[PDB]
Amino acid sequence: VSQVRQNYHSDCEAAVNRMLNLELYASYTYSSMYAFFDRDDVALHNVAEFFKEQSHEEREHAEKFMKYQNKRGGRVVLQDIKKPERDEWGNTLEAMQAALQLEKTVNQALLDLHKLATDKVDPHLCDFLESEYLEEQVKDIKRIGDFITNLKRLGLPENGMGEYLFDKHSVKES
Amino acid sequence: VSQVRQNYHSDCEAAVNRMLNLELYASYTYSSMYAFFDRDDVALHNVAEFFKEQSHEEREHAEKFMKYQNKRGGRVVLQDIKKPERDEWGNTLEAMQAALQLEKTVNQALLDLHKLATDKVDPHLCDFLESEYLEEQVKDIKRIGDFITNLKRLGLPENGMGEYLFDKHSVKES
Amino acid sequence: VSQVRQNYHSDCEAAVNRMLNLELYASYTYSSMYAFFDRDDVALHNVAEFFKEQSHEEREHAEKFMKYQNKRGGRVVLQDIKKPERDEWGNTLEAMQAALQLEKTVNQALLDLHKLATDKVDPHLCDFLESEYLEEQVKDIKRIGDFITNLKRLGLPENGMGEYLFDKHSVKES
Amino acid sequence: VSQVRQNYHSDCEAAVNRMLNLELYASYTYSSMYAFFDRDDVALHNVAEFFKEQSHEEREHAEKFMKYQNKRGGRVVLQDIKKPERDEWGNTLEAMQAALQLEKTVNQALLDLHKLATDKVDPHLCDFLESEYLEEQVKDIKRIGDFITNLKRLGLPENGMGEYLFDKHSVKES
Ligand SMILES: [Cl-]
Ligand SMILES: [Cl-]
Ligand SMILES: [Cl-]
Ligand SMILES: [Cl-]
Ligand SMILES: [Cl-]
Ligand SMILES: [Cl-]
Ligand SMILES: [Cl-]
Ligand SMILES: [Cl-]
Ligand SMILES: [Cl-]
Ligand SMILES: [Cl-]
Ligand SMILES: [Cl-]
Ligand SMILES: [Cl-]
Ligand SMILES: [Cl-]
Ligand SMILES: [Cl-]
Ligand SMILES: [Cl-]
Ligand SMILES: [Cl-]
Ligand SMILES: [Cl-]
Ligand SMILES: [Cl-]
Ligand SMILES: [Cl-]
Ligand SMILES: [Cl-]
Ligand SMILES: [Cl-]
Ligand SMILES: [Cl-]
Ligand SMILES: [Cl-]
Ligand SMILES: [Cl-]
Ligand SMILES: [Cl-]
Ligand SMILES: [Cl-]
Ligand SMILES: [Cl-]
Ligand SMILES: [Cl-]
Ligand SMILES: [Cl-]
Ligand SMILES: [Cl-]
Ligand SMILES: [Cl-]
Ligand SMILES: [Cl-]
Ligand SMILES: [Cl-]
Ligand SMILES: [Cl-]
Ligand SMILES: [Cl-]
Ligand SMILES: [Cl-]
Ligand SMILES: [Cl-]
Ligand SMILES: [Cl-]
Ligand SMILES: [Cl-]
Ligand SMILES: [Cl-]
Ligand SMILES: [Cl-]
Ligand SMILES: [Cl-]
Ligand SMILES: [Cl-]
Ligand SMILES: [Cl-]
Ligand SMILES: [Cl-]
Ligand SMILES: [Cl-]
Ligand SMILES: [Cl-]
Ligand SMILES: [Cl-]
Ligand SMILES: [Cl-]
Ligand SMILES: [Cl-]
Ligand SMILES: [Cl-]
Ligand SMILES: [Cl-]
Ligand SMILES: [Cl-]
Ligand SMILES: [Cl-]
Ligand SMILES: [Cl-]
Ligand SMILES: [Cl-]
Ligand SMILES: [Cl-]
Ligand SMILES: [Cl-]
Ligand SMILES: [Cl-]
Ligand SMILES: [Fe+2]
Ligand SMILES: [Fe+2]
Ligand SMILES: [Fe+2]
Ligand SMILES: [Fe+2]
Ligand SMILES: [Fe+2]
Ligand SMILES: [Fe+2]
Ligand SMILES: [Fe+2]
Ligand SMILES: [Fe+2]
Ligand SMILES: [Fe+2]
Ligand SMILES: [Fe+2]
Ligand SMILES: [Fe+2]
Ligand SMILES: [Fe+2]
Ligand SMILES: [Fe+2]
Ligand SMILES: [Fe+2]
Ligand SMILES: [Fe+2]
Ligand SMILES: [Fe+2]
Ligand SMILES: [Mg+2]
Ligand SMILES: [Mg+2]
Ligand SMILES: [Mg+2]
Ligand SMILES: [Mg+2]
Ligand SMILES: [Mg+2]
Ligand SMILES: [Mg+2]
Ligand SMILES: [Mg+2]
Ligand SMILES: [Mg+2]
Ligand SMILES: [Mg+2]
Ligand SMILES: [Mg+2]
Ligand SMILES: [Mg+2]
Ligand SMILES: [Mg+2]
Ligand SMILES: [Mg+2]
Ligand SMILES: [Mg+2]
Ligand SMILES: [Mg+2]
Ligand SMILES: [Mg+2]
Ligand SMILES: [Mg+2]
Ligand SMILES: [Mg+2]
Ligand SMILES: [Mg+2]
Ligand SMILES: [Mg+2]
Ligand SMILES: [Mg+2]
Ligand SMILES: [Mg+2]
Ligand SMILES: [Mg+2]
Ligand SMILES: [Mg+2]
Ligand SMILES: [Mg+2]
Ligand SMILES: [Mg+2]
Ligand SMILES: [Mg+2]
Ligand SMILES: [Mg+2]
Ligand SMILES: [Mg+2]
Ligand SMILES: [Mg+2]
């Protein structure tokens, strides 16, 4: 009943709201990782800044869904942002493994939303996901996988020198 | 079993490897056309350079598939690059006609890969083909068709002055 | 019977075509190494880019032989480009050892071509090889040998930290 | 008996003087072609300027041999510069065919001088010919052959429009 609404199924509107929540959840998990690596007894600053930036990017993903919802005439409905699964993240390897799984969880939700949009014959929503979300996921999943391979090569979790070197050379100097 | 792999069917992985080979094959055919037009008894330099650039572009298409394969967690598998169908290319008209058919053959393979990706519900691969390959083919097919029309207008194959003028005015001065 | 042909033996013409094929073969082998180091379970980006550049350089070597053939009035004859000997390259040390042997194989073929050119009293072809090919081989063979020495010093194949450091410090940052 | 002379055979000294004369002869022939195409009843200005530049380049080739002779401690001995074989050059095709044969005659003399230098074990003279003369000949022979192919394609000698177009598009605008 929005004056702009056209070819936008209620199911897709609802699924966009759920996806928005998941983006915010992902942002919050990354924020927790930032704070962990900033601890004085962890002290891997470039890794911390990597996760801070990851958090900001997820927040941007969320805001883009809010804007999308309104563009199509749907209505943003917010729910609680659940706290992350862990309060402490072990080390760079454990955190990167959790990040990989988080990005794959987000990717699966996006793929599921694409299936729904396809089922409801919504090519605009399909294009939006393909053009703004799906390649970002593939690229970041590859980046994080590459990191994990290098962390293993560097002898994580046991090799502290390896972990130190990863922070200096693999992630952006901040 | 790659840690990055998600929603990537074995059939699509294999078809990407076959497509990679076809891009390399197309590159090699264009390289042969370059060398032919550079012969002292052919001596159409702008036409030669046109095909040299076509060859480099196909090589870039191939490299982009290699990168894609790895991004999705598939594994690049290479096969022999078959030599071109001809050792000599007749004249500018015959070569352009062969180029048109080559670009249409490549296009059909890309369309077939899109059908497979659609069947396997792989929207990332669909988007990749649509965003990076399919429009390039339509544009180049149109360009080459336009050239063939002009070569016929110029009296090819019999009209040597027509062929000379095409090289001076239709293809980029190199 | 080309109008430009002068002092160019049929044997040399044929050997130039065979050398052209070998340059293309070398290019393809280096392309395979690039793709291997770009895998998410290998993930040595600077090493990957090193081999990508090696591949492009071999392609340039091939194109220079095509141009040479035509300049002398010979005729380019292409054959299949055989796929590389391996589908996977083990690690940076194994790949560099294979690269060393590849560059020495190419060098031996160039030296053999120089012997033929000398036998047929073709000083232009001798000069072409000496001025455009032979020093490139000596320089690259030295570079790759130096790399292998450093990879051994760094404890390859067992020392993953050593391999990580080589990628950061020995090859160009890409 | 020159104080600088070392490893310079009398035969090579004499052959350098004969080569010098041939370069001057080639210059003079090209000058005649320039004057012919500048005639009001020929009037192909870009072709005329092409041959004028060819003439100046041969003069530079001659001067470089004079300098070489003195560098090695030989003595420049000059002979008459014979007038060209023709007083009129027919048309662009006939002139280009004569230019091709002239450049091949010069090339054969250079190759013969290289054989002599090789026989007398004079690597400096071999290098001088290879580095300063032999590639220039191959390149110019290819250029002129390419021109002849295009003149034939353009319908020379009968097709006056073809000849006009060659002057506008194949040779440098002067
Ligand atoms: Cl609606
Ligand atoms: Cl509709
Ligand atoms: Cl609805
Ligand atoms: Cl909702
Ligand atoms: Cl709950
Ligand atoms: Cl977790
Ligand atoms: Cl915890
Ligand atoms: Cl997760
Ligand atoms: Cl957007
Ligand atoms: Cl995207
Ligand atoms: Cl990327
Ligand atoms: Cl990495
Ligand atoms: Cl370790
Ligand atoms: Cl890294
Ligand atoms: Cl999968
Ligand atoms: Cl899925
Ligand atoms: Cl599968
Ligand atoms: Cl395969
Ligand atoms: Cl086969
Ligand atoms: Cl064909
Ligand atoms: Cl053929
Ligand atoms: Cl085809
Ligand atoms: Cl891309
Ligand atoms: Cl495209
Ligand atoms: Cl267009
Ligand atoms: Cl056109
Ligand atoms: Cl016609
Ligand atoms: Cl015109
Ligand atoms: Cl056109
Ligand atoms: Cl010959
Ligand atoms: Cl000879
Ligand atoms: Cl022969
Ligand atoms: Cl051959
Ligand atoms: Cl075979
Ligand atoms: Cl091997
Ligand atoms: Cl293998
Ligand atoms: Cl080898
Ligand atoms: Cl060169
Ligand atoms: Cl070199
Ligand atoms: Cl050096
Ligand atoms: Cl080194
Ligand atoms: Cl070690
Ligand atoms: Cl450093
Ligand atoms: Cl080093
Ligand atoms: Cl002496
Ligand atoms: Cl001596
Ligand atoms: Cl003597
Ligand atoms: Cl003398
Ligand atoms: Cl006389
Ligand atoms: Cl004559
Ligand atoms: Cl005469
Ligand atoms: Cl002559
Ligand atoms: Cl000099
Ligand atoms: Cl030279
Ligand atoms: Cl050249
Ligand atoms: Cl030309
Ligand atoms: Cl005609
Ligand atoms: Cl024009
Ligand atoms: Cl031309
Ligand atoms: Fe970022
Ligand atoms: Fe991310
Ligand atoms: Fe996200
Ligand atoms: Fe990212
Ligand atoms: Fe292009
Ligand atoms: Fe193309
Ligand atoms: Fe292509
Ligand atoms: Fe194109
Ligand atoms: Fe390089
Ligand atoms: Fe190399
Ligand atoms: Fe090479
Ligand atoms: Fe090199
Ligand atoms: Fe010139
Ligand atoms: Fe010349
Ligand atoms: Fe000369
Ligand atoms: Fe020249
Ligand atoms: Mg209203
Ligand atoms: Mg609703
Ligand atoms: Mg949820
Ligand atoms: Mg709770
Ligand atoms: Mg995109
Ligand atoms: Mg983005
Ligand atoms: Mg990367
Ligand atoms: Mg694994
Ligand atoms: Mg499979
Ligand atoms: Mg195939
Ligand atoms: Mg075959
Ligand atoms: Mg597009
Ligand atoms: Mg493109
Ligand atoms: Mg157009
Ligand atoms: Mg002929
Ligand atoms: Mg032969
Ligand atoms: Mg071979
Ligand atoms: Mg085989
Ligand atoms: Mg020598
Ligand atoms: Mg030399
Ligand atoms: Mg050199
Ligand atoms: Mg070089
Ligand atoms: Mg060095
Ligand atoms: Mg004295
Ligand atoms: Mg004497
Ligand atoms: Mg003489
Ligand atoms: Mg006389
Ligand atoms: Mg040179
Ligand atoms: Mg020069
Ligand atoms: Mg040219």
Swiss-Prot record, chains A, B, C, D:
Lineage of source species: Eukaryota, Metazoa, Chordata, Craniata, Vertebrata
Stretches that traverse the bilayer: none
EC number: 1.16.3.1
Subunit structure: Oligomer of 24 subunits. The functional molecule is roughly spherical and contains a central cavity into which the polymeric mineral iron core is deposited.
GO CC entries: cytoplasm
Native source organism of the sequence: Aquarana catesbeiana (American bullfrog)
EC category name: oxidoreductase
Signal peptide bounds: none
Lineage top rank: taxon: Eukaryota
Chain residues that bind Fe cation 1: 23, 58, 61
Name listed for the protein in its UniProt record: Ferritin, middle subunit
UniProt function note: Stores iron in a soluble, non-toxic, readily available form. Important for iron homeostasis. Has ferroxidase activity. Iron is taken up in the ferrous form and deposited as ferric hydroxides after oxidation.
Reactions this protein catalyses: 4 Fe(2+) + O2 + 4 H(+) = 4 Fe(3+) + 2 H2O
Assigned protein family: Belongs to the ferritin family.
Residues given in the record as Fe cation 2 binding sites: 58, 103, 137, 140
